[PDB]
Amino acid sequence: PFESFLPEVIAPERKVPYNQKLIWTGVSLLIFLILGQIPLYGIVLYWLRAMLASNRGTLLELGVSPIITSSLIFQFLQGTQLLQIRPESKQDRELFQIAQKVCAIILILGQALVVVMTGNYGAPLPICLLLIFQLMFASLIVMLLDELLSKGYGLGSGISLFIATNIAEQIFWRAFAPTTVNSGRGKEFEGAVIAFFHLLAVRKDKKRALVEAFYRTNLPNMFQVLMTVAIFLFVLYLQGFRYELPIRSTKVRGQIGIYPIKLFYTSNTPIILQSALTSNIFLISQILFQKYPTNPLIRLIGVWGIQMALSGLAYYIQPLMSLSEALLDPIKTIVYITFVLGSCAVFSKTWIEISGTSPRDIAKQFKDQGMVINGKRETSIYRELKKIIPTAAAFGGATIGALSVGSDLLGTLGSGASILLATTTIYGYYEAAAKEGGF
Amino acid sequence: TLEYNANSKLITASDAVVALSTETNIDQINVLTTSLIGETNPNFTPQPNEALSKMIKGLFESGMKNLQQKKLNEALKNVSLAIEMAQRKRAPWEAFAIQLPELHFMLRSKIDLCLILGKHLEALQDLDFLLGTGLIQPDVFVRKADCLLKLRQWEEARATCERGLALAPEDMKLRALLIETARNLAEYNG
Amino acid sequence: VEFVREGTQFLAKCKKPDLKEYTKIVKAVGIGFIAVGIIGYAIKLIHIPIRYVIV
Amino acid sequence: NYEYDEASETWPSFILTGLLMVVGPMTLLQIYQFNEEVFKNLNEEYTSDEIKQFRRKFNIIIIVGWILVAILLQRINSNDAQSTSHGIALPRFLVDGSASPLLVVCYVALLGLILPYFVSRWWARTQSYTKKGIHNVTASNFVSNLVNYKPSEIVTTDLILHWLSFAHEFKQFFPDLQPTDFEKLLQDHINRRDSGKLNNAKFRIVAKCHSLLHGLLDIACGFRNLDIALGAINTFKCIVQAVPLTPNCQILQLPNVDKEHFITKTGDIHTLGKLFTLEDAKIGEVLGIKDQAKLNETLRVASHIPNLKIIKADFLVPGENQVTPSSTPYISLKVLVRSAKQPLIPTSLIPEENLTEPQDFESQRDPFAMMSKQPLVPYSFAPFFPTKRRGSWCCLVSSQKDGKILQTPIIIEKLSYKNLNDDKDFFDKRIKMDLTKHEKFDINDWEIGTIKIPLGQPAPETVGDFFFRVIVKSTDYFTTDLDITMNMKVRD
Amino acid sequence: NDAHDLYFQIKEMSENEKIHEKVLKAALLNRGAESVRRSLKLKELAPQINLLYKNGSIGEDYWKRFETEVKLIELEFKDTLQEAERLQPGWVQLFVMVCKEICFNQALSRRYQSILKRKEVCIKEWELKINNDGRLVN
Amino acid sequence: RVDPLVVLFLAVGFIFSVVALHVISKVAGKLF
């Protein structure tokens, strides 16, 4: 612990109304989005930039990376029980919060320096000084803006919000892209609805133009839009599933309520862990096959081809894009589906064990708050939660994996995980707004 | 502005129009000066006076004697004079916990006397003051309800009677007053 | 197959959203998502000709 | 590098699509697109014309989108039309023409001037207001007035009018007037006096006094003062009725009465039921209006304002049958909305089904769900109030140990006035023929409204009787309000 | 809205016209009693003010203004006590209790004097027909 | 310590400074 006087936004001593909160969210989002569309001045990893919702060559190149890394490492240091945090004090919480900022800023500096010294921008002092100043300023702006949105002026976190915003922006761009591409045949829009109506207007042959713009084996079409909106509505329907068990109080008599147990209990974690693991292992196998040209173990793990591995475990773990590959190798399909479902389910189990939401923890919390089951005893709460929480979590993870593989096979405009994150964040916002009560 | 008298040493506001706070503060300061003129010791103690309390008690007893004489007018006059003297010629630095109970005891007798005589508005004002100054007893709510019923204020009468019953519900007079109030109000609306 | 039976028994116990609540839910989430999407799309498109002019 | 539209062959389709995606849903939605109120007609028949004229004083996007779509379609149909070649749909002159700096300057203007100024204005506007709905200066004035408020000074209507005369939101309306002008205007309004020239200001400030009086009531309840709250409710009544607070005011709030005759002739009628005790022509002879067609209107309006009467009142705890120490119960009221012309019905005639509470988890989880399902109250009868208002009931609870308010007053508005309709007119007080044993009297036809008040504070940790006092006053009429006591028998 | 300036005005008048000395002591006692009463009023109203502020129905500036007034009252009281010690040597332990008592005494006297005005407002509001001797003539 | 309006102000000022630097560099390269 240490004492530091750093710039910080103060939380309001009174609860912010809903309208001002919504306006603040909107304006902060607009500012953050404009910040991501401006390139640097002195200038002359696609997986991470698509996952971390950042782009190269602009002021948002570092993006939310320092904040997300600091938050992750601090959550890990909390989980490993090396901080000895004590909730009985209101000072250790502030110390942890300010430690987050003091590590985030130095990570900003380190990342910006290594980028400016090793990036493809060039070795040749004022130029690199200005470039480092731009990046550090943008990063501190976005981190303090996230702090502001989390302090109470916003609906919730800024990181998940920005992730959902980039996801929705990519979804909308995949359908309404004004960019054109002319390769031999002519100019065709890169978006779905634009090219659809364009072909409907200019071809003057409805029976042919309909089927011509409906399939579009090369570019996104209206069928993908219908599939993605359908799975979006299905996810919406699947979010209302919940187990409400009746609870009553004992210490403070007269407090009757319910404890909701949603279906997506883990709330989008196991799928993102599975995707990160698959991406990492695929990159590792690819780099390993690149280093060692041919070896017994290297040929056994995977044989890369056109990049898509073949006759290897990496080939087996490849996701499905369309029904053609589904009918191609039914063995690979039936092993990949089972693998992803089992991995997501066991990830859900391990996460409900780790994150302190286990049925034993819930029974302990009930004992502290004094809440009990409506028509059951006190020494049966733990045994009843053992009958509900694990099965609910496993089944929710299984359905999340099923929705993911379905979005992957149907070929929607975006990954199933991205849509899941977007709908989950927006549903959390809506649930908070409805529980609080507002326009 | 303000003028200062010399021979009387009284402070008066020479302004044409003055606020209420300024007026009451000037009056309080004049009272303090008049008390300091009479009191001789520089470091005076909050211990009350003796001759003043004796005169108050004597006037109170002379008023009370007229009750045995069945003289309800001179008795009330003497009691009012005694209350006025106790409120006027008593320095503010006297013990509050001693100045208050004597005032309460004299005001209760004055209340009973004016209620028996027939003067009701002054009685109601006195009960209101004594109840707002920090004295709550069922012997007061009954008289307040009686006065309100006499001067035809049925809603406040019922409210005060209900508040009185909410403290000592074992009273037999409060319940009869409540019954009479309910009947009067039902006739008042019916 | 027992796991599927337990999952179905659990789903039977859950509270499915009715049409009236589902309508408000979908309205809110769709309005929010469409709003953030059009904001992102407009911000992405407007800055392209501006970037061409300036840069 | 991209290639902009050079011959105007791709941006027309883009604009047409963008406009379609907006006009379609709008056209679709446009093509797609319980309580009897007997005063909605009788109000406009007695309001003066000066108020009507004042109240009167204070889709084409579809068509333009369609015509633009038609124009763009015609323009498209009039047109003539191995490595990849990317291109952008935007025209070339928009980036390469002489208006190249124009786009960047309008963009930087919209970014640097319009956004910060507008957002700062919005923030300053939303910060200076109170969550209740009043300005911060007015709230500070009311709080300061209540702070240095001598408990010796009695609360009256004139004092609250003087306090309202310091409303900061009135200065924004008329920066030329003074608080004394506001006081004089409000006095002329209550006493039904004409301002001559500032009538538009008087009506404005009277219409605005609603939120001001509600904020003052909330501040008074926050400071735990009952006399000020009662005075505020009475002053709200006096403002909405345009009549000074008098003992016989329920009879003066009627539309067509003359004080110089009524006060001088009769001095015993002070309520509405006492008035209805008289005969039909006797009422008109007493009020001195002598007009049958005009007497019917006043009789109908006087026989249609709600008078309250409790049936069962007690403390309820959700999920239990008795009050325990440190428990959180609420107040349950069973009122009977009646008119002063109907006689009283005994409590024994109640079928006991409307008073019993349903015992189900969904019902005892949120006890206010069944309350929030009652129909709203009709519009008030205030021919002198500028705007149109609905009825309202401000319920507040205090303690009986000292007489101090202990919670904010709940403003209830959902209530059924079915018992006031003209269908049950045989139930008259002047008949005195035991209308309980009538061929038209059906005890299941009378609906009994319910009122549930959250207590906001838990039960005391002690064990015994703790008396309370709940007061349910009206806000628009001078009817018979509720003032009852109830004690929680803490028994564990 | 205070008597603090009254003592200063009286002191300025004494510094020029050579007025009596007991009036200065009286004004000082009055200011002390008013400060004691205001401090007690603030101490009693602090929880209700805090509740109204947390409920979001009073604003933000008034909260900090009241918080500053909290210490302003204490500073005024300290100044009053310092001036009292300056005027009379070794008169600090008795002055405190004296002003403490005269506060309640003057509060009671004002509350009792107010009944004279309170008695006519009831007449005006309820339209009583009261002849002499306070009796009613209906 | 920091107010949200100050945050908006400094952010928009920074963006304006960046775009101003860009455009002045462009016009300087175009004229000179």
A345 token code pair? 């389910």
Residue D218 contacts residue D408 (beta carbons within 8 Å): yes
**By the 8 A CB rule, do D415 and D393 touch?**
yes
Whether the CB-CB separation of A416 and A406 falls below 8 Å is answered with yes
- Dist CA D160 CA D157 (whole Å): 5
Q: What DSSP designation does A318 have?
A: P
The long-range contacts involving B47-50, CB below 8 angstroms and separated by at least 24 positions, are B47/B94, B47/B95, B48/B90, B48/B94, B48/B95, B48/B98, B48/B99, B49/B90, B49/B91, B49/B94
Say how far apart CA A91 and CA B6 lie, in whole Å: 65
**CA-to-CA separations, D305 to A217, D276, D327, D489, in angstroms, rounded:** 73, 13, 38, 36
Number of domains forming the structure of chain E: 1
From CA B157, how far away is CA B149, in angstroms rounded? 6
Mutate to test the interface with A, among F6, F9, F14 (most CBs of A within 10 A): F14
E59 neighbourhood in chain D, CB within 8 Å: 130, 136, 139-140
If DSSP codes are grouped into helix, strand and coil, which group holds residue A205?
coil
Tokens of D385: 């109030």
Q: Is residue A357 part of a domain?
A: yes
CATH architecture group of domain D310-340+355-427+442-490: Sandwich (2.60)
- Do D87 and A180 count as a contact with CB atoms less than 8 A apart? yes
In chain B, where do the E strands start and end? Answer: 3-4, 11-12
Count the neighbouring beta carbons within 10 Å of the beta carbon of residue F11: 22
Specify which residues B3 forms β-bridges with: B12
Gyration radius (Cα) of chain C, Å: 22
Q: Which residue range(s) make up the domain with A115? A: 18-175+226-436
Which residue segment(s) compose the domain that C48 sits in? 1-55
Nearest to C25, CA basis, from A236, A4, B83: A236
Contacts of D479 (CB under 8 A, 6+ apart): D250, D272, D305, D306, D307, D308
Q: Chains with 3 or more CB pairs closer than 8 angstroms to A?
A: C, D, E, F
Stated as kind and residue range, the H or E segment containing B164 is: helix B154-165
Chains adjacent to D (≥3 CB pairs closer than 8 angstroms): A, B, C, E, F
B139's tokens? 């012997």
Query: Quick check: D464 and D490 in contact, CB under 8 A?
Result: yes
The single residue listed with the structure tokens 């406040």 is B156
Residue in the block written with tokens 């709230």: D139
Residues ≥6 apart with Cβ < 8 Å to D44:
D52
* Domain total of chain A: 1
CA distance C50 to chain D (A): 6
Cα–Cα dist E24/B33, whole Å: 9
A:136-195 residues touching chain F, CB 8 A cutoff: 137-138, 141, 144-145, 148, 153
User: Which residues pair with residue D485 across a beta bridge?
Assistant: D469
Instruction: Give pairs for E1-5: CB < 8 Å, separation 24+.
Output: E1/B21, E1/D148, E2/B21, E2/E34, E2/E38, E3/B21, E3/B25, E3/B29, E3/E27, E3/E30, E3/E31, E3/E34, E4/E31, E4/E34, E4/E35, E4/E76
A372-373 and D393-399 strand pairing: unpaired
Q: Say how far apart CA B76 and CA B71 lie, in whole Å.
A: 9
Chain A touched by C7 (CB under 8 Å): yes
The superfamily in CATH containing domain D136-245 is Sec63 N-terminal domain-like domain (1.10.3380.10)
D112: chain F residues, CB-CB within 8 Å? 12, 16
Question: Across the interface, do D116 and F8 touch by the CB < 8 Å criterion?
Answer: yes
What chains are in contact with F, requiring at least 3 Cβ pairs below 8 Å? A, C, D
Three-class SS of residue C6? helix
- Of A25, A41, A32, the closest CA to residue A60 belongs to A32
Contacts D151 to B, Cβ<8 Å: 132
The span from the first CA to the last CA of chain A, in angstroms, equals: 43
Please indicate whether, in this complex, the C-beta atoms of D76 and A257 are within 8 angstroms of each other.
no
What's A151's DSSP letter? I
The answer to whether D237 and D381 are in contact (CB under 8 A) is no
Cβ neighbours of E105 in B, within 8 Å: 92-94, 96, 99
**CB atoms near residue B98 (< 10 Å):** 13
Q: How far apart are CA B22 and CA E30, in angstroms?
A: 12
Nearest to A395 among C10, C16, C39 (CB): C10
Residues in chain E: 138
Estimate to the nearest angstrom the gap between the alpha carbon of D137 and the chain centroid: 23
Q: Dmax over Cα atoms in chain C, in whole Å?
A: 65
Indicate the SS3 state at residue B41: coil
What single-letter amino acid sits at A374?
N
d(CA A392, CA A201): 51
- Sheet containing D86-88, strands listed edge to edge, beginning at the edge strand earlier in sequence: A187-189, A179-182, D86-88
Q: How far does F12 lie from chain D, in Å, by closest CA? A: 7
User: How many structural domains is chain C composed of?
Assistant: 1
Residues in Cβ contact with D374 at an 8 Å cutoff, skipping those fewer than 6 apart: D414, D415, D416, D449, D450
Q: C touches F (3+ CB pairs < 8 Å)?
A: yes
Tokens (6 digits) for D336: 């009977």
- Owner of token pair 């007695």: D46
**CB contact (8 A) between residue D485 and residue B132:** no
In the chain, the amino acid numbered D318 is P
Provide, for chain C, the percentages of residues in helix, strand and coil under a 3-state DSSP scheme, each rounded to the nearest 5.
85, 0, 15
Which of chain A's residues have a Cβ under 8 Å away from the Cβ of F7? 9, 144-145, 148
3-state per-residue secondary structure call for chain D: CCCCECCCCCHHHHHHHHHHHHHHHHHHHHHHCCCCCCHHHHCCCCCCHHHHHHHHHCCHHHHHHHHHHHHHHHHHHCCCCCCCCEEECCECHHHHCCCHHHHHHHHHHHHHHHHHHHHHHHHHHHHCECCCCCEHHHHHHHHHHHHCCCCCCCCCHHHHHHHHCCCHHHHHHCCCCCHHHHHHHHHHHHCCCCCCCCHHHHHHHHHHHHHHHHHHHHHHHHCCCHHHHHHHHHHHHHHHHCCCCCCCCCCCCCCCCCHHHHHHHCCCCCCHHHHHCCCHHHHHHHHCCCCHHHHHHHHHHHCCCCECCEEEEEEECCCCCCCCCCCCCEEEEEECCECCCCCCCCHHHCCCCCCCCCCCHHHHHCCCCCHHHCCECCECCCCCCCCCCECCEEEEEEECCCCCECCCCEEECECCCHHHCHHHCCCCCCCCCCHHHCCCCCCCCCCCCEEEEECCCCCCCCCEEEEEEEEEEECCCCCCCEEEEEEEEECC
* Residue whose C-alpha is closest to residue C54's, from D87, D90, D101, A31: D101
Closest CA–CA distance from residue F8 to any residue of chain D (Å):
8
Q: Which residue of C43, C51, C54 is the best one to mutate when testing the F interface, meaning the one whose CB has the most F CBs within 10 A?
A: C54
Distance, CA of A266 to CA of A258 (rounded, Å): 20
State in Å, rounded, how far the first CA of chain C is from the last one: 63
Residue in chain C nearest A396 by alpha carbon: C7
Within its chain, how far is the Cα of D210 from the centroid?
Answer: 9
D403: left (phi over 0), alpha (psi -120 to 50) or beta: left
| Cβ-based contacts of F19 with chain D (< 8 Å) | 108
Output b/e per residue, A331-349; b: 16+ Cβ within 10 A: ebbeebbeebbebbbebbb
Q: How far is the C-alpha of A305 from the C-alpha of A319, rounded, in Å?
A: 15
E51, E56, E126 ranked by CB distance to D247: nearest: E126
Max Cα–Cα distance, chain B, nearest Å: 68
- Residue whose structure tokens are 């008690």: B57
Of D164, D294, D233, which Cα lies nearest the Cα of D241?
D233
Cβ contact, residue pair A15, E56, below 8 Å: yes
The span from the CA of D162 to the CA of D155, in Å, is: 11
Quick check: helix, strand or coil at residue A259?
strand
DSSP 8-state code for residue A12: P
Strand blocks (E) in A263-356: 303-305, 308-310
> Of D115, D214, D128, D122, whose CA–CA distance to D164 is shortest?
D214
Q: Which two tokens stand for residue D468?
A: 């309370």
Q: Which amino acid, one-letter code, is at E23? A: V
Q: Do C25 and A240 touch (CB under 8 A)?
A: yes
Neighbours of A429 (CB within 10 A): 21
Contacts of F26 in chain C (CB under 8 A): 54-55
The domain segmentation of chain D, as residue ranges, is: 136-245, 260-302, 310-340+355-427+442-490
Q: What distance in Å separates the CA atoms of residue D357 and residue B23, rounded to the nearest whole number?
A: 60
- Spatial CA neighbour of A168 closest among C33, B18, D246: C33
CB D326 within 8 A of CB D458: yes
Q: How many CA atoms lie within 13 A of A89 on its CB side?
A: 9
Q: Establish, for the pair of chains A and D, how many residue pairs have beta carbons separated by less than 8 Å.
A: 95
Helix (H) or strand (E) holding A188: strand A187-189
Q: Within a domain: residue A186?
A: no
In total, chain A counts a number of residues equal to 439
Tally of CB atoms within 10 A around D474: 23
**E1/D151 Cβ within 8 A:** no
**Which phi and psi angles does D36 have, rounded to 5°?**
-70, 130
Q: Which two tokens stand for residue A370?
A: 């004094």
Answer yes or no: are the C-beta atoms of A258 and D365 closer than 8 Å. yes
User: Contact F14/A20 with Cβ under 8 angstroms?
Assistant: no
Verify whether the Cβ–Cβ distance E53 to A15 is below 8 Å. no
Do residue D116 and residue F12 have CB atoms under 8 angstroms apart? yes
Q: Compute φ and ψ for D483, nearest 5 degrees.
A: -150, 95
- Helices E93-113 & E115-126, crossing angle to 10 degrees? 30
Q: Which two tokens stand for residue D107?
A: 């963009």
Count the helices and strands in chain E (H runs, E runs): 5, 0
How many CB atoms sit inside 10 A of residue E129's CB? Answer: 10
Q: Do B132 and E134 touch (CB under 8 A)?
A: no
F12, closest residue in chain A (CA to CA): A31
Q: Do D219 and E58 lie within an 8 Å CB cutoff?
A: yes
The C-alpha atoms of residue A312 and residue A290 are separated, in whole angstroms, by 15
Instruction: Give break positions in chain C: residue before each, C–N beyond 2.5 Å.
Output: none
To which H or E segment does residue A261 belong? strand A256-262
Q: What is the residue whose two structure tokens read 């470091």? A: B43
A58 bridge partner residues: A39
Beta bridge partners of A243: A261
Question: From CA D91, how far away is CA D4, in angstroms rounded?
Answer: 5
CA distance E90 to chain D (A): 34
C-alpha–C-alpha distance, residues D292 and D289, integer Å: 9
Q: Any chain B CB within 8 A of the CB of E107? A: no
Q: For residue A248, give the H/E element and its range.
A: strand A242-248
| Phi–psi pair at D490, nearest 5 degrees | -65, 115
Closest C-alpha among E107, E114, E31 to residue E73: E31
Distance from CA of E42 to the nearest CA of D (A): 9
Measured between beta carbons, the chain A residues lying within 8 angstroms of F22 are 41
F5: which chain D residues are within 8 Å (Cβ-Cβ)? 119-120, 123
What is the Cα–Cα distance from D142 to D136, expressed in whole angstroms? 10
Q: Which residues of A touch E53 (CB under 8 A)?
A: 13-14
CB contact under 8 A, D119 and F16: no
Would you mind telling me the total number of residues written for chain D in this entry? 492
Three-state DSSP class for residue A376: coil
What CA–CA distance (Å, rounded) separates A32 from A164?
A: 13
Q: Are B110 and B79 in contact (CB under 8 A)?
A: yes
Residue A225: alpha-carbon gap to chain centroid: 21
Counting beta carbons within 10 angstroms of the beta carbon of residue D291, is it exposed (0 to 12), middle (13 to 18) or buried (19 or more)?
A: exposed
Q: How far apart are CA A101 and CA D455, in angstroms?
A: 44
Cβ–Cβ of B119/E135 closer than 8 Å? yes
Task: Kindly report the nearest CA distance between residue B25 and chain E, in angstroms.
Answer: 7
Question: Is E in contact with C (3 or more beta carbon pairs below 8 Å)?
Answer: no
> Measured between alpha carbons, how far is F15 from A34 in angstroms, rounded to an integer?
9
Please give the structure tokens belonging to residue A394.
């496993």
Distance from CA of A105 to the nearest CA of E (A): 33
**D chain contacts of residue A251, beta-carbon cutoff 8 Å:** 326
- Chain E positions touching B4 (Cβ under 8 A) are 13, 17, 19, 23
Q: Which domain holds residue E110?
A: 1-138
Find the angle CA(D13)-CA(D19)-CA(D22) to the nearest 5 degrees.
145
Answer whether A281's CB lies under 8 Å from A317's CB.
Answer: yes
| Cβ neighbours, 10 Å, residue B168 | 12
Q: Which residues pair with F21 in a beta bridge?
A: none
**Which amino acid type is present at position D470?**
V
The residues of B whose Cβ lies within 8 A of any Cβ of D are 132, 155, 158-159, 162-163, 165-167, 188-190
The verdict on a CB contact (< 8 Å) between D469 and B166 is yes
Distance from CA of A273 to the nearest CA of E (A): 42
Give me F19's structure tokens: 């775009």
- In chain A, residues with a C-beta closer than 8 Å to the C-beta of C7 are 391, 394-395, 398
Bridge partners (DSSP) of residue D394 are D411, D473
